[PDB]
């Protein structure tokens, strides 16, 4: 390796609010219980959601979870896929999300792996270096 910053998050959790630090800390770990890389994005009065969504895609994050005060009450997040057809799941129960994520993920991987190292046989410094 070299250092290891973080990389692409299978399912990144978007939490603009702070109060939802624990609640979000779950939905995120929940996706991890499936064996999917998840992270927590805190935007404590900083930037906006999109700003994160933009980094989500560009970052690689195929799935992005939306968290917020309300979402806390209803206890539901918004799973927005970044890869493949534009599928926007609005209002979804954790259990479901976990299934929609655990399910999609399975497939996504099938398309992710593809094969033992793509045809490309040369790295010569890749993306994300800093």
Burial class (CB in 10 A: 0-12, 13-18, 19+), 74: exposed
10 neighbors 62 (Cβ within 8 angstroms):
yes
SS3 58: helix
Nearest 5°: the CA angle 76, 27, 114 is 110
76-81 sheet: strands from edge to edge: 38-42, 11-15, 63-67, 76-81, 88-93
Q: Where are the beta strands (DSSP E) in 37-121?
A: 38-42, 63-67, 76-81, 88-93
**Which token pair is 84?**
């493949």
Positive/negative CA dihedral, 113, 117, 119, 122: positive
**Which token pair is 105?**
């993920």
Structural domains for the chain: 1-116 (3.40.50.800)
The span from the CA of 89 to the CA of 91, in Å, is: 7
Name the experiment that determined this structure.
NMR
């Amino acid at each position: 390796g070299s250092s290891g910053s973080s990389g692409p998050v299978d399912c990144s959790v978007i939490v603009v609010n702070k109060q939802t630090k624990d609640y979000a800390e779950s939905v995120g770990r929940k996706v991890r219980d499936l064996g999917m890389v998840v992270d927590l994005i805190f935007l404590n009065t900083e930037v906006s959601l999109s700003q994160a969504l933009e980094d989500v895609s560009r970052g690689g994050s195929p799935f992005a979870i939306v968290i917020t005060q309300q979402h806390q009450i209803h206890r539901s997040c918004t799973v927005n896929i970044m890869f493949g057809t534009p599928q926007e799941h609005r209002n979804m129960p954790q259990a479901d999300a976990m299934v929609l994520v655990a399910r999609n993920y399975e497939r996504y991987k099938n398309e992710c792996r593809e094969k033992e190292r793509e045809e490309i046989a040369r790295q010569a410094s890749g993306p994300s270096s800093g």
